[PDB]
Amino acid sequence: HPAAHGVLRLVMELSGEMVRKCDPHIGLLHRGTEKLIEYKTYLQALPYFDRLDYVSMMCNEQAYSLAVEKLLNIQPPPRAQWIRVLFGEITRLLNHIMAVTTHALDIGAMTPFFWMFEEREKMFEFYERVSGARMHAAYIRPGGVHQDLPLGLLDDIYEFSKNFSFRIDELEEMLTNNRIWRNRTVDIGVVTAEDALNYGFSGVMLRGSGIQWDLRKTQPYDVYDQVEFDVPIGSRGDCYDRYLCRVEEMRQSLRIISQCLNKMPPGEIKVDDAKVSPPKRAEMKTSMESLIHHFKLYTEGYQVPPGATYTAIEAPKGEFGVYLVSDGSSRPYRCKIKAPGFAHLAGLDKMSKGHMLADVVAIIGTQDIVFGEVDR
Amino acid sequence: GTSVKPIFSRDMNEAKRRVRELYRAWYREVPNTVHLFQLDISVKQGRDKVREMFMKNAHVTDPRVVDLLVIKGKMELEETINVWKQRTHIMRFFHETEAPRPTDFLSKFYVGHDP
Amino acid sequence: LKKTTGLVGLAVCETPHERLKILYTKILDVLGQIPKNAAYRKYTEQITNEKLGMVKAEPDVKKLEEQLQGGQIEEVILQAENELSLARKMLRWKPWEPLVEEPPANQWKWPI
Amino acid sequence: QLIAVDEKLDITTLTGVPEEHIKTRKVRIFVPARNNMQSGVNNTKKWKMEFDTRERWENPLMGWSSTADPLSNLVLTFSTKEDAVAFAEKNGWSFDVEERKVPKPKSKSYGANFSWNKRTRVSTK
Amino acid sequence: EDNKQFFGRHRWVIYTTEMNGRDTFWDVDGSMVPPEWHRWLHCMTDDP
Amino acid sequence: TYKFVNMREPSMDMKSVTDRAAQTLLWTELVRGLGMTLSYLFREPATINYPFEKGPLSPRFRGEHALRRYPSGEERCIACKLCEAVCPAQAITIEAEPRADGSRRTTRYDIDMTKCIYCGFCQEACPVDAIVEGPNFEFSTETHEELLYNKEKLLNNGDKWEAEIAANIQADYLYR
Amino acid sequence: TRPTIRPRNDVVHKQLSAFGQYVAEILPKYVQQVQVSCFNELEIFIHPDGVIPVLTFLRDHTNAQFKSLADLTAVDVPTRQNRFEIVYNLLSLRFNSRIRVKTYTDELTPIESSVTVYKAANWYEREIWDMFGVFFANHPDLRRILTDYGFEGHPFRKDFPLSGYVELRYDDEVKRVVAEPVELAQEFRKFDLNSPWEAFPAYRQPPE
Amino acid sequence: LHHALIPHGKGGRSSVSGIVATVFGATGFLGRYVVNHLGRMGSQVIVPYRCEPYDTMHLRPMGDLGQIIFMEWNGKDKDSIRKVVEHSNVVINLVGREWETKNFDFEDVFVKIPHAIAQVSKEAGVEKLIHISHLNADIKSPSRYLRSKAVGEKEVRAAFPEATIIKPSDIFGREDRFLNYFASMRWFGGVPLISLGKETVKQPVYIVDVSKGIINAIKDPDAKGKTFAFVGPNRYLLFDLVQYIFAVAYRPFLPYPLPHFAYRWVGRLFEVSPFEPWTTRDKVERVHMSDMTLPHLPGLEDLGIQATPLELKAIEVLRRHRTYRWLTSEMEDVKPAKTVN
Amino acid sequence: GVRTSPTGEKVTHTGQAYDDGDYRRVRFSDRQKEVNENFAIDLIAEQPVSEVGSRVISCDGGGGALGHPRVYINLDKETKTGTCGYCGLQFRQPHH
Amino acid sequence: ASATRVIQLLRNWASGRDLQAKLQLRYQEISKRTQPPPKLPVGPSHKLSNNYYCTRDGRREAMPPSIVMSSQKTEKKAVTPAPPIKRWELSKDQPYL
Ligand SMILES: COC1=C(OC)C(=O)C(C/C=C(\C)CC/C=C(/C)CC/C=C(\C)CC/C=C(\C)CC/C=C(/C)CC/C=C(\C)CC/C=C(\C)CC/C=C(\C)CC/C=C(/C)CCC=C(C)C)=C(C)C1=O
Ligand SMILES: NC(=O)C1=CN([C@@H]2O[C@H](COP(=O)(O)OP(=O)(O)OC[C@H]3O[C@@H](n4cnc5c(N)ncnc54)[C@H](OP(=O)(O)O)[C@@H]3O)[C@@H](O)[C@H]2O)C=CC1
Ligand SMILES: CN(C)C(=N)NC(=N)N
Ligand code: SF4
Ligand code: SF4
Ligand SMILES: [Zn+2]
């Protein structure tokens, strides 16, 4: 189904066209990611997170890397942290573009999809230049980042950031004050703050309902405590307010990108601990200890001290968390993945009370569900 | 522990009562399953398969295990009634595409190393 | 006075002080049934009397909100209602009793 | 109050394993032998439960090693022989238990290499 | 090449009408470019 | 800090009321949307003329795999199985034995391109730069088996793309 | 300074320890153990029948307003008598904190459903049942959520094989998809990666 | 045996069954069923085809990677026949048309092609050869189809003395001719029958049973040079059979007698179609002809297969011919036809 | 230097070639066998032997960081050449 | 880009903004695909003296979690997990949209 994101079976009970109950059937994209992670090492499990929410790739990677670093009791270098924040905001722009444009496409607007996807192509070019893969970079790793930026990436990112506010303004010229868009989105899928908190919504859902909560402000990670940005807050808790919140979050991510570009520091890109992060190629090919550590890291991997952690980040779709349990070996014993879309899709039924089929389409769009992360 | 927490049904009598209730629920459903899914099997075949699936767990002597089995049976039934399943799964109950696995020692010896 | 609380589903209350006094008095009344040595009774009585003292000494709603540090006065009222319901449930549950049962010999060991 | 079940625990009907792999499988509970190529003994701390070896054949294409045994790579770790035995019994597989082999204490003396009248004297260093 | 065009259309290729033993007047492939011109066309470098 | 996205209120003065009434009766924002769409119509499209124009790429690009050689012609791979060990998808199979001259060389080196996730860990773990992920990406096949590469196919890919692979490695090896 | 070593937060460690003592004193009937990890994460191990009272307290108490149920999962440890370990991760927005509550259960012992405390517990407990076989007593709708219709066995258990027991394909004779016993063209290769040398002296266990 | 031909596994999709079979006419009804069974067993299958490669697409998912090989062949090309049978130890012959095209006739498809396949297979050293014929293959039969069948059977036995010649009666299945041909007479008003179908007795055989028998004949070591007859368990009059077909299809049944010469002229009219003809004079002759009784020849019970009665698998074929009114009617709703035993 | 088997099938550098009676040769019918015509053993034989006036030599494969890890070869046994085994390169002390 | 002035003026009128100030196509303003070679910084732990791994071993500083309360083994004020979150201040940059 075009509006079902391809892999969602939504068994609906309709009286005419009014919705009586929604029964989302998920698992059509269940792969057994957690079991496979239990069978892989820590370095071999990063692409699994890369493929969980395939619209916020470096965000998933950053969450996993934060969990592993917290368990390892190490610290990424400041340049690595700044790169992580910059690319996290770039990925937030990517995800918000995808969400808003697919929402408008499910409602009946496609030209913003095409424009913002040209912008997405440019950001994919940034991804590919920094990593070699257009979307599934596998770039952010426990201890920092894999490789340093090329010598034109910052200038190109500055050019793109400079020429993107006009794109957002053109998007807003088509939907924000349009009466048809307001009719479709206003007072649709209204969720109260208490209901959102009880159902476990996170991120844009809470902020649209009016809850002043943002993990980047309350529980900062990396260098998010050194950047300045505003947190959009909704008033009516509907699709229109959530769309406005997402657009303003795009603008604030542009702010953060500008700040990161100006404040990019020098230094190394991964923790200077060859027992955790691999050494350079020259050191490997000239130093005996470096060769031994490269061999061991790429065959057995680093051992993580026993313990369990739950680390969460403000991924573009809400609070994305990982509960990682290590038994002292080089492979994770348990890896539970908390995707924000799981609770939202669980709460889809309540938000679609007294609505119709088109309203349910709009509510799914405003929930912004990715079933890779929903099912895992 | 000596005082194991019961799921329900307490002793084995109430567990048997729940087993019989679930058996009645399944038995009255086979004609509807055949009609809706447009199965090519007979109603007698469906009832026989329900009977066989019930009988393969006849050796259970633990009330908690019986309660879990009837819970999962009710889950399977509610999957069938709501047409959540397809003809694919209902026929998966029948193993219609498997070759008849040999069971005698001589045939097992001939085919391979399987005990 | 204020138009909205900024939270969907949270209506503005025109009588914050009276409602807060009533709720805190009800909570204190419920806590009287709990045995004296129970640690839930002491802490909850302390915090309730501490917060009930503030509402009787500050007529201004904004300064009262700043003193309570519990969000807006509507959020404080909602939390008082939740505390009252929790006190009733805790009266039913009686969790001040000793431990129900010790776990097996190695239940929380890790790594294992 | 609370019921009592005076019978051995058995969850074979709930695990979902096929009857073939329930009845015709004999697991091996043991402490792994130390890898003789290394002196480290940290891999001989926990008991391991592993299944019997089944057939592996050669793929007609690409010559890979095919298999048909689901439990070929299934190895479980248990802290104690009693725990492993209880798990195997409740899961219904047959099991063979092998006792842990710990090296016997040995008397080592550096001065025995220079004995005045014993054969323990070494001819080189 | 034409640098006045925007990035992406400032380099292009006209494929041959016959390659090896195939009549390639119409059915032009994207894999017909040898590696060096492939690198230059995909802009991994500015040196032809 | 925080900001409100939708918290404004319209002025109720007569001029603003008449402006809103005119916007309601005369579809002003709809005309604005039409104007934006017309502007985009008169703009220049971003479509490239594929396959005659190819999208930009970088020296770090991960494409089809290849097995390289030293300039002398000897194979770089030393059968160390680091790529096989680190491969997340277990898409690499390696079997080796002493060669006729005693070298440590592989006899089987298979990569399943329907199982590989193109993550590039194999070229990171290679200590001799033998296995690489080249720049080619136009290698779609009509049959499944053609995507199950072996040592001969990977060596052919290396010989076919050696110049471009060497140039890319020279361009990007200082960041590794 | 040590650039490669994560700094500690004694203030947060002390606050979490004080709150753990607070909850342990308030609820002696269920709280079996309290821990604070060295990266400032509070954990409470309680008796399995105290799930509802403990969660209700941690949600409604004024000093513990853990309104949001961040996560709910289980961990399978076969070597224990009670293999399944149910984990609740809670977030308190008012006090800007997180807590963890861990209980234990086995195959045949139900765990009281916590959908009356948090609504996300509905789908979280459905997933726990589907993946581990743990039954929740008062669940409004308890059924498989992720596995295939009619799937047998609970995949996330440690004793469930990685590839399962059945695989699907389309059989032209019956004109439908069929499920047949698993058979791999290339078997998954098991690697023994653990080094035989102890890595962390601080986690050494008594030989016993 | 060669080390590559030793069976391995548990007879699944990824196992090795030691069978390398060249299946001529695999792009057909019985051909597709046989190829599916071979691939499910886990055998190497070579599919010689002359049609468009698009029409061979359904055979691809029938086997694991590299087990199905498609090689273009020409019927009158011994070079292509040798190319496709060079490396196979079993050769199955299922080539046959129910009509005669401009380039191929019943002599070509039933005598020349089977003889060429048998002779070339003998030179190539193929261990086993299965050849499909018709049960009512009579040298003096009124039907050119059956005359060519008998002559080609004799030629095949002469060329390859160690052959297994199988004689199915009337295969019925989803993509069959029999049940579909009898159920497609709705469009032409009533059902024309010769002598009202009262002088014809037929026992159709199930397609899956035929395919299983063919597979078992390969694995049976003492079926090298034999002749098997594959017939169903029940014999019906033609009138009763067509009446049961229409009853299961839930279509009104209006039969009427049509004289044999008039029916032959009607068949002559329908065979002028350049495409696949709806019916032909030979088809009318075969339909009117009664199925022979051959007690001395072995059968499905001798090969280890229990013949599936028509009353069980008739609904698989005839449910497609129903309307929305009777689509969901159950299998048991229609009484079995009156048998003649 | 590719060689042809008695069945007409080219042998790879690993000596792989199906037997005459092997059914698996049918996969190459109407298609081709992917064989690399350059043999590394032959090429490295074609490469000459270097002569350096030192007991110990160091080989990194050339190119610095583009080559293999640096190793040291002891040129003391004059009856044979010292072969760096990463790249199969032979060094020798000048005798006579 | 390359366009006539009349079409540019029509686009400016229809869109309401000077498009040539901020376009969506890249014309020679991006960095060249060929760049001078870099020389990345080495790191903090690349010293030749006073650099022992035992003094900078992050993993070995990890400790088993402290057991605050274990059942096996005045008037204290009630506490909280942390001081209550302070109220967020409205943005001075743009408080309202
Ligand atoms: C993950 O998943 C995905 C999603 O989430 C589910 C997504 O959202 C998306 C996003 C998708 C989008 C954004 C796409 C939507 C946006 C768009 C812009 C798509 C727009 C689509 C359309 C406009 C489709 C409409 C067009 C259609 C359907 C084509 C129909 C074509 C026709 C020709 C109609 C038929 C006309 C006929 C038959 C006319 C016939 C005429 C005659 C018979 C007349 C005959 C006349 C004669 C014979 C006269 C002859 C005369 C002469 C002179 C000839 C003589 C010459 C001779 C040589 C003979 C993607 C990609 C996705 O991946
Ligand atoms: N079907 C029945 O009722 C009965 C059939 N038989 C016999 O069983 C065999 C299989 O019958 P069935 O599957 O039903 O019939 P089909 O017509 O469906 O199949 C015939 C097969 O032979 C191929 N073929 C036909 N003509 C030629 C030719 N000139 N050269 C090469 N290949 C050719 C066809 O391929 P393509 O797609 O290219 O035409 C197709 O693969 C036949 O020999 C038939 O006589 C025996 C008793 C009953
Ligand atoms: C977001 N994803 C994965 C979609 N498939 N989306 C869509 N609109 N089709
Ligand atoms: S790119 Fe990754 S998945 Fe692919 S072969 Fe290399 S290591 Fe394996
Ligand atoms: S990592 Fe390199 S040298 Fe080692 S086995 Fe793989 S390709 Fe060969
Ligand atoms: Zn060398």
Could you tell me the two tokens for H303?
């090969």
Cross-chain CB nearest to F145 (options D61, D63, D64):
D61
Q: Residue H212 corresponds to which amino acid?
A: K
Total Cβ atoms within 10 A of residue G176: 17
Identify the domain containing residue I59 by its residue range: 40-92
Q: How many domains does chain H divide into?
A: 1
Residues 6+ apart with CB under 8 A from C9: A192, A193, A194, A195
Report the nearest atom of ligand 3 relative to the CA of A55.
1
Probe residue for ligand 5, chosen from F68, F78, F132 as the CB with the greatest number of ligand atoms within 8 Å: F78
A87 C-beta closer than 6 A to ligand 1: no
Q: CA B97 to CA B110: how far, in whole Å?
A: 22
Residues A134, A138, A144, A147, CA torsion sign: negative
**Ligand 5 atom at shortest distance from the alpha carbon of F67:** 7
Ligand 3 contacts CB of residue A5 (under 6 A): yes
Q: For residue I82, give the ligand nearest its CA.
A: 6
Residues near A11 by beta carbon (within 8 Å), at least 6 away in sequence: A22, A23, A24, A25, B82, B84
∠C44-C47-C53 over CA atoms, to 5°? Answer: 135
Chain F partners within 8 Å of E28 (Cβ): 51-52
DSSP B28-81: TTHHHHHHHHT-SS-HHHHHHHHHHHHHTTTT---HHHHHHHHHHHHHHHHHHH
I59 appears as a binding residue in the annotation: yes
Instruction: Report the alpha-carbon distance of residue J81 to residue A34 in Å, rounded.
Output: 31
Beta strands in J21-89 (DSSP E): 66-70
Interruption sites in chain H after residues (C→N beyond 2.5 Å): none
The SS3 assignment for A301 reads coil
Q: What's the gap in Å between G156 CA and the centre of ligand 3?
A: 28
Any idea what the Cα angle at residue C74 is, between residues C69 and C80, rounded to 5°?
Answer: 75
**Chain C: partners with 3+ C-beta pairs within 8 Å:** A, D, G, J
Identify each DSSP E strand in A149-250 by its residue range.
Answer: 231-233
The number of beta carbons lying within 10 Å of the beta carbon of residue A165 is 13
Alpha-carbon distance of H232 to H311, in angstroms, equals 11
How far apart CA F163 and CA H224 sit, in angstroms, is 60
Q: How far apart are CA H118 and CA H146, in angstroms?
A: 19
**Among J24, J25, J53, J55, the residue to mutate for chain A (most A Cβ within 10 A):** J24
- Name the minimum distance, in Å, from the CA of H206 to any CA of chain B: 15
Nearest alpha-carbon partner for A241 in A190, A286, A193: A190
> What value does the CA radius of gyration of chain D take, rounded to a whole number of Å?
23
Reference F98, options A292, I43, I81, I41; nearest CA is I41
Question: DSSP letter at F120?
Answer: -
Q: Which residues sit with their C-beta closer than 6 Å to ligand 4?
A: F 86-89, 91-92, 111, 116-122
The values of phi and psi at residue B16, to 5°, are -65, -40
Report the neighbours of E using a cutoff of 3 or more CB pairs below 8 angstroms. F, J
Q: Which residues of D22-37 are buried (b: 16+ CB within 10 A; e: fewer)?
A: beebebbbbbeebeee
How close is the nearest chain D Cα to the Cα of B28, in Å? Answer: 25
Range of the domain at F131: 64-175
Q: What is d(CA H270, CA H289) in angstroms, rounded to the nearest whole number?
A: 20
**Strand (E) or helix (H) holding I59:** strand I56-59
Distance CA F124, CA F87 (A): 11
Yes or no, beta carbons of E46 and J34 under 8 Å apart: yes
Q: Which of H260, B19, A280 is nearest to J39 (CA)?
A: A280
Q: How far apart are the first and last CA of chain G?
A: 40
The Cα D34–Cα G110 span in angstroms is: 41
- Give the residue numbers spanning the domain of D97: 19-113
Length in residues, chain E: 48
Retrieve residue G104's tokens. 């234990």
Name the structure determination technique: cryo-EM
- Binding residue ranges of A for [4Fe-4S] cluster: 51, 136
Asked if residue H275 lies in contact with residue H211, where contact means CB atoms within 8 angstroms, the answer is: no
Which residues of chain E lie closer than 8 angstroms to J34, CB-CB?
Answer: 45-47
Interface of C with J (CB under 8 A): 42-44, 46-47, 69-71, 99, 102
Q: How many domains does chain B contain in total?
A: 1
- Which domain, by its residues, includes B82? 1-115
Q: CA-CA distance, A105 to A94, in Å (whole number)?
A: 16
Name the residue among A140, A146, A257, A234 with its Cα closest to residue A187: A234
Residues H42, H64: Cα–Cα separation, whole Å = 8
Percentage helix, strand, coil for chain A under 3-state DSSP, each rounded to 5: 50, 15, 35
Contacts 24+ apart (CB under 8 A), F91-94: F91/F115, F91/F116, F91/F117, F92/F122, F93/D62, F93/D64, F93/G186
- C-alpha to C-alpha distances, H312 to G176, H168, H176, H317, nearest whole angstrom: 18, 19, 16, 11
Q: Distance (Å, rounded) from C-alpha H303 to C-alpha G169?
A: 28
Torsion C60-C63-C65-C68 (CA) sign: negative
Cα separation, H129 vs E41, in Å, equals 57
Identify all chain A residues contacting C8, using CB atoms and an 8 Å cutoff.
190-193, 209-210, 234-237
Say if ligand 3 is within 6 A of residue A267 CB.
no
Quote the tokens at residue F78. Answer: 């030393």
Resolution (A): 3.1
SS3 for chain H, per residue? CCHHHCCECCCCCCCECCCEEEEECCCCHHHHHHHHHHHHHCCEEEEEECCCHHHHHHHHHHCCCCCEEEEECCCCCHHHHHHHHCCCCEEEECCCCCCCCCCCCHHHHHHHHHHHHHHHHHHHCCCEEEEECCCCCCCCCCCHHHHHHHHHHHHHHHHCCCEEEEEECCEECCCCCHHHHHHCCCCCCCEEEHHHHCCCEECCEEHHHHHHHHHHHHHCCCCCCCEEEECCCCCEEHHHHHHHHHHHHCCCCCEEECCHHHHHHHHHHHCCCCCCCCCCHHHHHHHHCCCCCCCCCCCHHHHCCCCCCHHHHHHHHHCCCCCCCCCCCCHHHCCCCCECC
Domain count, chain D: 1
H29-41 and H207-219 are packed helices; what angle lies between their axes, rounded to 10 degrees?
Answer: 50
Q: Are strands D56-58 and D65-67 parallel, antiparallel or unpaired?
A: antiparallel
Q: How far is CA A188 from CA A23, A111, A350, F56, F112, in A?
A: 19, 23, 12, 42, 48
Strand, helix or coil at D14?
A: helix
* Assigned domain for D100 exists: yes
Distance from CA of F92 to the nearest CA of H (A): 18
Probe site for chain H from B30, B34, B38, B113 (most H CB atoms < 10 A): B38
